[model samples]
Target: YKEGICLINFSQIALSTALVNFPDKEKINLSMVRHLILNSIKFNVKKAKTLGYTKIVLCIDNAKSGYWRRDFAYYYKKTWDWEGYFESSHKVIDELKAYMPYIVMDIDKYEADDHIAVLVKKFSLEGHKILIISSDGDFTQLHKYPNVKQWSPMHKKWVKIGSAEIDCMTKILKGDKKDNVASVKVRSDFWFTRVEGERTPSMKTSIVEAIANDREQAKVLLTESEYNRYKENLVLIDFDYIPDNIASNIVNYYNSYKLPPRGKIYSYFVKAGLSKLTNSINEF
Candidate 1:
């Protein structure tokens, strides 16, 4: 069997770590984050091993929470300069090299999902089997390749990537409320437009085709303003549509792991109060 390469979506894992319930209802701290990091590596490696993967590639998100900060600025009725969280996240990622030695960290320009999509395609083309460990549906596009699949630890099941083309198109049209990408309101008549006296926008592809063909029902249902936003949201939500130049930069970061010394792993753990994980550092 071909050895598999596992990509851990670090941003999702970090956020999930913050939500983990600990004794005393303690909020996530550096110490807890370190513990989560160690366990994340262990969990991913174990899962990868079972799926025939021998290499672990942790992809970290380095984007500062700019939009998040801006949105919360009004809470203080002034500029909210809480960059400490961003700095802390970066520090943790930087220290990961000492703890794990296998990671890809320079693709902050693109989101983690975009980076994963690019790298997954590159590796699959090179005949390397790929395993993605994340709950994000964005990676579902990579399932077009037989050598690629995603595992969601929280759900305890492999993510099913069905009709990737249609899946992305749906998001493009519907706009993802969770991500703040705006779409035409669900109540828009466009969604309820009918052809042959029956509503026809049930499937994502059908909706897209109606707009693409400039069908009378679509033209009647959609407004010019909503269409413009829909066009922009398509680029924002579709994983398969990144520019070729940007995709190349993403692909360049593949196999970017820097080997670290065993002693350094122990030193990092000791400094971060994660000495308990030091014993397993050498295993990587």
Candidate 2:
């Protein structure tokens, strides 16, 4: 049997958990981000091994600005939650190129979410058990598949496998505050709320809550424009809606992608005095 594959959402694992664990106000350097990200790789890789996945691939988003979701919903992901360590985080991939197997899987103009979905779809189809290492609740949608399993590194728990469709719209309606995507009930940004004063026409508290909790209720309360926005949100929030070109590009990238030559991890770890990591090196 093929060893289970670990699909890591590198964009999140590489920075999200690291930032939360290692908060720093100053110093634009990669000092902390690099250290923590490497630690994350080690940690997640070990977790994947424990879960019985031997092969691993890192899903990275090369195009943050070009994310197609932004085009659908302009308000989607208006602001990033983190405190600006993006550039330095990329340096972790380059600076430590020697010791790690940076099997990056990416496609231009697409987010890592799409990449991961494609990977999960293909691997599961091949009868391989797949483990998704990500804290993004969005991944829960993929749990509908039998072979799929997810772990939330941030939450430090196995993401509960649940109804994909319900969770999909729930996440959309609840709105991910971290990304600035507003809830369907309230007019969050000034553009939606402003007419003359500030506050605007909106869905009722109960009805809005009801609609989000159950998508069927949306049609009755929502205006045509608002309904259209809801419809667009469906495509944006659901990973299954990733278009053919984007999906094709991801599969192509994966099939053709090859890991670059890397220097031995022993010398690198010995230099850092990371004997524990060094001893359990096979886990990575």
Candidate 3:
């Protein structure tokens, strides 16, 4: 009953929604927008307020927007998709921040959407209640946080959904033209459901469909899967190259937005970087 929550969003969703006209050559003026995007945002604001969240964090990846995490050469299937996503969020968050005082709106910059997930996890562990508002399936990892929940405005599913085992491979593999990561479909399919430290239901058909193929099938499986479930799913961070400090600092900086204990746990990990924070959290 903290009466507060964070609405996290990625650039992929933001930009695409903003710039409407491809123009003569697809160059965005950054000041122009489509009427459809305008009305859509108008709809989104009312929806967020209806949900009872007081704060909205427009999460973005500071990591180069086009480059997929694991591989460099492969770009996502379409540049426009990625660009439009960032544009949409970029426009909405700023507009909302100016108009919606009831909501604490901000953006977190990092390599991926997981930045928000990491923060959500840290906050939940610290006993602060939260709802991670996003439509992306990747956010299922946040469901594990007892105090942290997820809300997807696009999907508009309000019921509390459980954590799902997701594979790092699926996101980057099978020639994800959008993400541009070198992932084998088999590996992504296998690992997402890997039952290690958690219930990975890869063998389950429904889970396979959702994790390996589509969400519709996954929803069906959720209705019947007997596999051990996780309230909070796990995510793989691209810690191999970026300094852990950057990741940690990003979280810490955001948590500092509120006084001590608001998002202290998340701040600490973000400051400590997830890779190292895992070790520290265990000691306690």
Which structure among the candidates has the greatest lDDT?
2
Among these predictions, the greatest TM-score belongs to 2
- Please give each candidate's TM-score: 0.73, 0.76, 0.50
lDDT of 1 at 219: 48
| Model 2 lDDT per residue over 143-196, tens place | 877689998877888888525555666655554556555555545443433367
Winner by TM-score between candidate 3 and candidate 1? 1
lDDT of 2 at 254: 84
Clashing pairs in 1: none
Model 2, residue 48: C-alpha shift (Å) = 0.8
In each prediction, how many residue pairs overlap at the backbone (N, C-alpha, C within less than 3 A)?
0, 0, 32
Tens digits of per-residue lDDT for model 3, 110-183: 44464565567556677666766567666665665676667665567753542343443234222233342223
Span of ten consecutive residues with least summed lDDT in model 2: 185-194
lDDT of 1 by residue, 1-284 (tens): 55578877877886665455333333445655556666767777788877787777777664443322123121111122224334455667777766556765455445677667777777788889999889888787788876888999778799985366656656666755456554454322332232455432333456665554443444455677656546556556666566677687766666555677556777777887766767777555
Ranking by lDDT: 2, 1, 3
Could you give the C-alpha RMSD of every candidate to the true structure, in order shown? 7.6, 4.3, 14.5
Question: With candidate 2 superimposed using the best TM-score fit, by how many Å does residue 171's alpha carbon deviate from the native?
Answer: 3.9
